[PDB]
Amino acid sequence: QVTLKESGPGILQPSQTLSLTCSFSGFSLSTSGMGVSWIRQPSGKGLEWLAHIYWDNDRYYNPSLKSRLTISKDTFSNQVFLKITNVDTADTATYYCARSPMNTWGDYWGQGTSVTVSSAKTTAPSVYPLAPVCGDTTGSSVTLGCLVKGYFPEPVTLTWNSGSLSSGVHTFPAVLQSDLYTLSSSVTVTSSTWPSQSITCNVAHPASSTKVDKKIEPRGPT
Amino acid sequence: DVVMTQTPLSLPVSLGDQASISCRSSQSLVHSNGNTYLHWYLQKPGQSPKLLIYKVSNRFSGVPDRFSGSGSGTDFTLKISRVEAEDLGIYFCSQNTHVPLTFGAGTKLELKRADAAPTVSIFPPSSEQLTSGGASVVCFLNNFYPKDINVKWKIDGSERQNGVLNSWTDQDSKDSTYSMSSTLTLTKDEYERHNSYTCEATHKTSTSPIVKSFNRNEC
Amino acid sequence: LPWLNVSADGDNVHLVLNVSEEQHFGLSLYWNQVQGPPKPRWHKNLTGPQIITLQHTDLVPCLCIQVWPLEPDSVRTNICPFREDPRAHQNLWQAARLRLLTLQSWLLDAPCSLPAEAALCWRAPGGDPCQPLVPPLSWEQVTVDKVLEFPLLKGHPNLCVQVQSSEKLQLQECLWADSLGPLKDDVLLLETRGPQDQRSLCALEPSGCTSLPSKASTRAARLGEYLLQDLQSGQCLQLWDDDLGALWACPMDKYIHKREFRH
Ligand SMILES: *[C@@H]1O[C@H](CO)[C@@H](O)[C@H](O)[C@H]1NC(C)=O
């Protein structure tokens, strides 16, 4: 089968050079008509084509990024490269290489490599319990939450009761608040479960080597 | 650049239904060699795009007969005959007639189910956050259908737009519902100036919005 | 007639004047057209029969002869033997010129005054023949030493003024070549207006007129949606406006950097 695998540093600072490698098998760039393209996709956004190289070393670039891109290959090593100079936050994306022969452009894609460009420093999250407003629950169910605020970089892992509480859980995708990420998770249990039984969210941020356990406590008076 | 206008952006379907996706280009995709380099791709979560149709109507290797492409010049259509669970994902059109190569924004093919009102829950700032000098008010809008929903924040009955951060889950694989988190971030000084905090959800399941509120003075 | 004969066989033109050996007569050669203030004239008091020799290059349809016996108050006889001669009409057009007085004012200068029709033409940068714009325009009558008033909104280096007579092309003066020249790579758009809010946009291409938007691989059809936008955005130059038509010159330099991917 045709297989392509992208590699490169996961995090860079603005103005640095991004060096990407596409290592492939199942085809050769010595084959007449063969080509390889690089494409990127910012999270939840559309795809943006970057550059293309054919077996004869004819190269094509996205005109808007042209001066910052360099595509090249090593046929003997079954590799294609992309150099992006002077990176900035807009270069944060998943980068894909795709086999692109003359008749079928982008017919096989690699699984991609994630790249984050930011000036943010490693920051451990602040983990806050979200208990309902002070007052005894009258409903059959109760919703609790966990707010994971101001961390960099991604990811964080979040579990409830060390993974033993998995049903009725909604862990929301992280979003950027300036330079830092924020995510939240909700858990819904029966009112006969909480507060009579312990509910704790377990947050790990491997990048800062931080692990926080926040027990959700009923709120008291102000 | 050749703009690829894809419609609809969201396509709810039932399994076994037919789905139609349109792609319109800003200029003709007919190359000087006479070919039309319009492609269709499918991308699944955590996965890379897979080529479905190349040159308007040619099915790529292994692509089922249920996928068909048609059109010419600037107007193109992808038709999916008997939608299966494995077809759910984001469909995009692409052109490689012109440099730069461009793509549509994508059509999310999602599952249809009966309408479900959101379960709305509001949370005041934690004592720990307030000690830090910050004040986030969180609202969860959980397990609703359809995905279209509006959240309005009110402070002492007055609408607040600034400092609102929203996040949405993808459609649930088991109950086909959507969930949303809306966080209003204020300074603790701003929080300490007002009493009532309200999260209002506008959803097609109610003519009047679902309102969840709390008063900063508790128990 | 029995006194004048013509011989174009001596590689020159001969006027054989068949009169008696004793005949005294006045002979005058003229160009039958209003010339203005006193000019020197071609005149000869003779004693016939004579053979007046002319050059094939002097021949014009209004070249006429005036004869009269040298008697007091004798009547003058006029004959125009070149009225329908092919060579005369050939030379006539070689010597004719079209000029600009104002953008909306043109003047025809010719030795003789024949019926003629004029209309605007569109020259493409690729050497290919100058295509006239009939329709939406029409061949209007042009009279020698009389003003031709066309409602040309703007001059264009690609526009030439064409002149026909006996339904044949004789003149092609590209009036805006030295003033506004050289040829611009602008697409000409021809919207033909009619009944029921009708307006059909067409693009004058080397290979005929193509209606827009079109599915072709031809430059203007491919750019159809863009050209229709330039026009609506007012980036196109209006050359002519009418109750049932409009002409537009759309520059293509904005698409000069657009390239296709290789296949
Ligand atoms: C021609 O002859 C008449 C007399 O018959 C004379 O009056 C006239 O001047 C002559 N023309 C010229 C050019 O001398």
PDB file of C-alpha atoms in Angstrom, chain C residues 85-183:
ATOM      1  CA  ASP C  85     -13.234  52.566 -64.712  1.00  0.00           C
ATOM      2  CA  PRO C  86     -11.703  50.004 -62.215  1.00  0.00           C
ATOM      3  CA  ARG C  87      -8.226  51.614 -62.130  1.00  0.00           C
ATOM      4  CA  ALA C  88      -9.721  55.134 -61.373  1.00  0.00           C
ATOM      5  CA  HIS C  89     -11.610  53.895 -58.232  1.00  0.00           C
ATOM      6  CA  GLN C  90      -8.415  51.958 -57.264  1.00  0.00           C
ATOM      7  CA  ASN C  91      -6.326  55.220 -57.332  1.00  0.00           C
ATOM      8  CA  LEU C  92      -9.134  57.272 -55.710  1.00  0.00           C
ATOM      9  CA  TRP C  93      -8.990  55.232 -52.434  1.00  0.00           C
ATOM     10  CA  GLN C  94      -5.139  55.180 -52.393  1.00  0.00           C
ATOM     11  CA  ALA C  95      -5.422  59.033 -52.141  1.00  0.00           C
ATOM     12  CA  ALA C  96      -8.337  59.119 -49.603  1.00  0.00           C
ATOM     13  CA  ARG C  97      -7.848  59.911 -45.843  1.00  0.00           C
ATOM     14  CA  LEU C  98     -10.010  59.889 -42.686  1.00  0.00           C
ATOM     15  CA  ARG C  99      -9.232  62.461 -39.943  1.00  0.00           C
ATOM     16  CA  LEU C 100     -10.286  63.369 -36.391  1.00  0.00           C
ATOM     17  CA  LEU C 101     -11.763  66.849 -35.704  1.00  0.00           C
ATOM     18  CA  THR C 102     -13.119  65.826 -32.248  1.00  0.00           C
ATOM     19  CA  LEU C 103     -13.599  62.281 -30.858  1.00  0.00           C
ATOM     20  CA  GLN C 104     -17.290  62.505 -31.980  1.00  0.00           C
ATOM     21  CA  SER C 105     -16.309  64.228 -35.339  1.00  0.00           C
ATOM     22  CA  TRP C 106     -14.539  62.577 -38.374  1.00  0.00           C
ATOM     23  CA  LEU C 107     -13.706  63.934 -41.857  1.00  0.00           C
ATOM     24  CA  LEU C 108     -13.196  62.167 -45.217  1.00  0.00           C
ATOM     25  CA  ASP C 109     -10.695  63.668 -47.696  1.00  0.00           C
ATOM     26  CA  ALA C 110     -10.800  62.234 -51.232  1.00  0.00           C
ATOM     27  CA  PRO C 111     -10.133  63.661 -54.777  1.00  0.00           C
ATOM     28  CA  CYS C 112     -13.644  62.491 -55.933  1.00  0.00           C
ATOM     29  CA  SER C 113     -16.841  62.166 -53.923  1.00  0.00           C
ATOM     30  CA  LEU C 114     -18.391  58.676 -54.161  1.00  0.00           C
ATOM     31  CA  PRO C 115     -21.104  57.130 -51.884  1.00  0.00           C
ATOM     32  CA  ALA C 116     -19.420  55.562 -48.856  1.00  0.00           C
ATOM     33  CA  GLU C 117     -20.309  53.938 -45.539  1.00  0.00           C
ATOM     34  CA  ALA C 118     -18.266  54.010 -42.302  1.00  0.00           C
ATOM     35  CA  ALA C 119     -18.189  52.087 -39.000  1.00  0.00           C
ATOM     36  CA  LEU C 120     -15.913  51.284 -36.007  1.00  0.00           C
ATOM     37  CA  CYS C 121     -13.669  48.253 -36.088  1.00  0.00           C
ATOM     38  CA  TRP C 122     -11.882  46.211 -33.259  1.00  0.00           C
ATOM     39  CA  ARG C 123      -8.243  45.141 -33.716  1.00  0.00           C
ATOM     40  CA  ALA C 124      -6.885  42.315 -31.491  1.00  0.00           C
ATOM     41  CA  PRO C 125      -3.221  42.382 -30.237  1.00  0.00           C
ATOM     42  CA  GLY C 126      -2.494  39.043 -32.006  1.00  0.00           C
ATOM     43  CA  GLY C 127      -2.175  40.393 -35.574  1.00  0.00           C
ATOM     44  CA  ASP C 128      -5.524  38.748 -36.602  1.00  0.00           C
ATOM     45  CA  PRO C 129      -7.876  40.890 -38.851  1.00  0.00           C
ATOM     46  CA  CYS C 130      -9.764  43.932 -37.548  1.00  0.00           C
ATOM     47  CA  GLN C 131     -13.387  42.735 -36.847  1.00  0.00           C
ATOM     48  CA  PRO C 132     -16.087  45.456 -37.437  1.00  0.00           C
ATOM     49  CA  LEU C 133     -18.776  45.969 -34.818  1.00  0.00           C
ATOM     50  CA  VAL C 134     -21.832  45.566 -37.068  1.00  0.00           C
ATOM     51  CA  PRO C 135     -23.866  44.722 -34.978  1.00  0.00           C
ATOM     52  CA  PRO C 136     -24.638  46.545 -32.502  1.00  0.00           C
ATOM     53  CA  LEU C 137     -23.318  49.426 -34.644  1.00  0.00           C
ATOM     54  CA  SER C 138     -24.290  50.106 -38.305  1.00  0.00           C
ATOM     55  CA  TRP C 139     -22.482  51.225 -41.503  1.00  0.00           C
ATOM     56  CA  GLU C 140     -23.406  54.916 -41.649  1.00  0.00           C
ATOM     57  CA  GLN C 141     -23.081  57.062 -44.797  1.00  0.00           C
ATOM     58  CA  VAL C 142     -19.797  59.077 -44.965  1.00  0.00           C
ATOM     59  CA  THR C 143     -19.697  62.012 -47.434  1.00  0.00           C
ATOM     60  CA  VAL C 144     -16.349  63.478 -48.820  1.00  0.00           C
ATOM     61  CA  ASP C 145     -15.483  66.927 -47.271  1.00  0.00           C
ATOM     62  CA  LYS C 146     -18.505  66.542 -44.810  1.00  0.00           C
ATOM     63  CA  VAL C 147     -18.406  65.826 -40.964  1.00  0.00           C
ATOM     64  CA  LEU C 148     -19.228  62.279 -39.689  1.00  0.00           C
ATOM     65  CA  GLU C 149     -20.585  62.587 -36.086  1.00  0.00           C
ATOM     66  CA  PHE C 150     -20.297  59.247 -34.141  1.00  0.00           C
ATOM     67  CA  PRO C 151     -21.423  58.974 -30.415  1.00  0.00           C
ATOM     68  CA  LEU C 152     -18.046  57.521 -29.346  1.00  0.00           C
ATOM     69  CA  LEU C 153     -17.898  57.914 -25.561  1.00  0.00           C
ATOM     70  CA  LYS C 154     -14.090  57.240 -25.450  1.00  0.00           C
ATOM     71  CA  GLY C 155     -11.207  56.655 -27.849  1.00  0.00           C
ATOM     72  CA  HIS C 156      -9.412  53.299 -27.756  1.00  0.00           C
ATOM     73  CA  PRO C 157      -6.079  52.276 -29.390  1.00  0.00           C
ATOM     74  CA  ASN C 158      -7.771  48.992 -30.481  1.00  0.00           C
ATOM     75  CA  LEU C 159     -10.503  50.929 -32.342  1.00  0.00           C
ATOM     76  CA  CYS C 160      -9.979  51.646 -36.053  1.00  0.00           C
ATOM     77  CA  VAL C 161     -12.434  53.537 -38.410  1.00  0.00           C
ATOM     78  CA  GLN C 162     -13.366  51.424 -41.463  1.00  0.00           C
ATOM     79  CA  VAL C 163     -14.605  52.910 -44.875  1.00  0.00           C
ATOM     80  CA  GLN C 164     -16.513  50.926 -47.535  1.00  0.00           C
ATOM     81  CA  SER C 165     -17.932  51.852 -51.014  1.00  0.00           C
ATOM     82  CA  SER C 166     -19.612  49.420 -53.509  1.00  0.00           C
ATOM     83  CA  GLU C 167     -19.839  47.206 -50.330  1.00  0.00           C
ATOM     84  CA  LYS C 168     -15.946  46.751 -50.429  1.00  0.00           C
ATOM     85  CA  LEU C 169     -13.377  47.883 -47.769  1.00  0.00           C
ATOM     86  CA  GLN C 170     -11.214  50.847 -48.862  1.00  0.00           C
ATOM     87  CA  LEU C 171      -9.937  52.564 -45.627  1.00  0.00           C
ATOM     88  CA  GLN C 172      -8.828  51.364 -42.144  1.00  0.00           C
ATOM     89  CA  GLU C 173      -7.491  54.360 -40.106  1.00  0.00           C
ATOM     90  CA  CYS C 174      -6.532  53.398 -36.554  1.00  0.00           C
ATOM     91  CA  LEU C 175      -7.142  56.940 -35.291  1.00  0.00           C
ATOM     92  CA  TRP C 176      -5.993  56.306 -31.672  1.00  0.00           C
ATOM     93  CA  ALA C 177      -2.692  54.460 -32.425  1.00  0.00           C
ATOM     94  CA  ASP C 178      -0.267  57.409 -32.150  1.00  0.00           C
ATOM     95  CA  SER C 179      -2.379  59.353 -29.601  1.00  0.00           C
ATOM     96  CA  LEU C 180      -3.303  56.457 -27.206  1.00  0.00           C
ATOM     97  CA  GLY C 181      -1.332  53.477 -28.719  1.00  0.00           C
ATOM     98  CA  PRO C 182      -0.143  50.710 -28.828  1.00  0.00           C
ATOM     99  CA  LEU C 183      -2.806  47.911 -28.707  1.00  0.00           C
TER     100      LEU C 183
END
